[PDB]
């Protein structure tokens, strides 16, 4: 499934939400670049105004698409993600907001012709109506974060727990901690790894000449956790070592 993720690959991302009643449907287009770990996605709210903060959805959209994450060589055989290709993956996560509501998330990521396709349920409860998600108090902005991806065995899957760090307008930090879980669609052999990480850095920004609400995120995503081989065999002074 690696074979499939050596270019430039289109993606689409399809939404439909609704949180604490508040519905709304996004639209997305990219481009995944998983030879660099790179990634490009526009996404647009076809309905309106998306009644919920952009960044707050960055990881459903994308942390979405995780088989455009770049693993090292020496990683490859801990790549879930591509190893479910084509056939795809189901993604889903709780996402609990620190004082206020959760995100539970439905997805399906899968090609469609040549086409990675990313098609997403969200279900938003017991948000507060003047809170930091409701009352648009995120930054348009994004941190750095790992993911630690574990094998989910029972499940020929994988599981990861992380939490994110939203920047509020007063300077705080509105945590999003997420529970994620992914089993492969296809009944074809996966990977299933050993402990790893995924780094990943996003990047938030608009199109200036786009009037509809949206947002454009260029993200980077490395595999890491497991030390190459290399650092012993050439004594390399940069990895962790005793002497
Ligand atoms: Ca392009
Ligand atoms: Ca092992
Ligand atoms: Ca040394
Ligand atoms: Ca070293
Ligand atoms: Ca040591
Ligand atoms: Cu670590």
Same mark, same amino acid.
């Given at each position: 499934?690696?074979?499939?993720?050596? @270019?430039?690959?289109?993606?689409?991302?399809?939404?439909?939400?609704?949180?604490?009643?508040?519905?709304?449907?996004?639209?997305?287009?990219?481009?995944?670049?998983?030879?660099?770990?790179?990634?490009?996605?526009?996404?647009?709210?076809?309905?309106?105004?998306?009644?919920?903060?952009?960044?707050?959805?960055?990881?459903?959209?994308?942390?979405?698409?995780?088989?455009?994450?770049?693993?090292?060589?020496?990683?490859?055989?801990?790549?879930?993600?591509?190893? #479910?290709?084509?056939?795809?993956?189901?993604?889903?996560?709780?996402?609990?907001?620190?004082?206020?509501?959760?995100?539970?998330?439905?997805?399906?990521?899968?090609?469609?012709?040549?086409?990675?396709?990313?098609?997403?349920?969200?279900?938003?409860?017991?948000?507060?109506?003047?809170?930091?998600?409701?009352?648009?108090?995120?930054?348009?902005?994004?941190?750095?974060?790992?993911?630690?991806?574990?094998?989910?065995?029972?499940?020929? @899957?994988?599981?990861?727990?992380?939490?994110?760090?939203?920047?509020?307008?007063?300077?705080?930090? =509105?945590? #999003?901690?997420?529970? =994620? =879980?992914?089993?492969?669609? @296809? #009944?074809?052999?996966?990977?299933?790894?050993?402990?790893?990480?995924?780094?990943?850095?996003? #990047?938030?920004?608009?199109?200036?000449?786009?009037?509809?609400?949206?947002?454009?995120?260029?993200?980077?995503?490395?595999?890491?956790?497991?030390?190459?081989?290399?650092?012993?065999?050439?004594?390399?002074?940069?990895?962790?070592?005793?002497?």
């Amino acid at each position: 499934g690696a074979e499939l993720f050596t @270019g430039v690959v289109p993606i689409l991302v399809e939404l439909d939400g609704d949180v604490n009643g508040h519905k709304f449907s996004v639209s997305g287009e990219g481009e995944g670049d998983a030879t660099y770990g790179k990634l490009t996605l526009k996404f647009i709210c076809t309905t309106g105004k998306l009644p919920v903060p952009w960044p707050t959805l960055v990881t459903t959209f994308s942390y979405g698409v995780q088989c455009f994450s770049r693993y090292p060589d020496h990683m490859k055989a801990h790549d879930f993600f591509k190893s #479910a290709m084509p056939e795809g993956y189901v993604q889903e996560r709780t996402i609990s907001f620190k004082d206020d509501g959760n995100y539970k998330t439905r997805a399906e990521v899968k090609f469609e012709g040549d086409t990675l396709v990313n098609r997403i349920a969200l279900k938003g409860i017991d948000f507060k109506e003047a809170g930091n998600i409701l009352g648009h108090k995120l930054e348009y902005n994004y941190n750095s974060h790992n993911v630690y991806i574990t094998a989910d065995k029972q499940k020929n @899957g994988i599981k990861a727990n992380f939490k994110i760090r939203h920047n509020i307008a007063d300077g705080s930090v =509105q945590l #999003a901690d997420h529970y =994620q =879980q992914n089993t492969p669609i @296809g #009944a074809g052999p996966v990977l299933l790894p050993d402990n790893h990480y995924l780094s990943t850095q996003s #990047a938030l920004s608009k199109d200036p000449n786009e009037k509809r609400d949206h947002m454009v995120l260029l993200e980077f995503v490395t595999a890491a956790g497991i030390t190459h081989g290399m650092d012993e065999a050439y004594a390399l002074e940069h990895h962790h070592h005793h002497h």
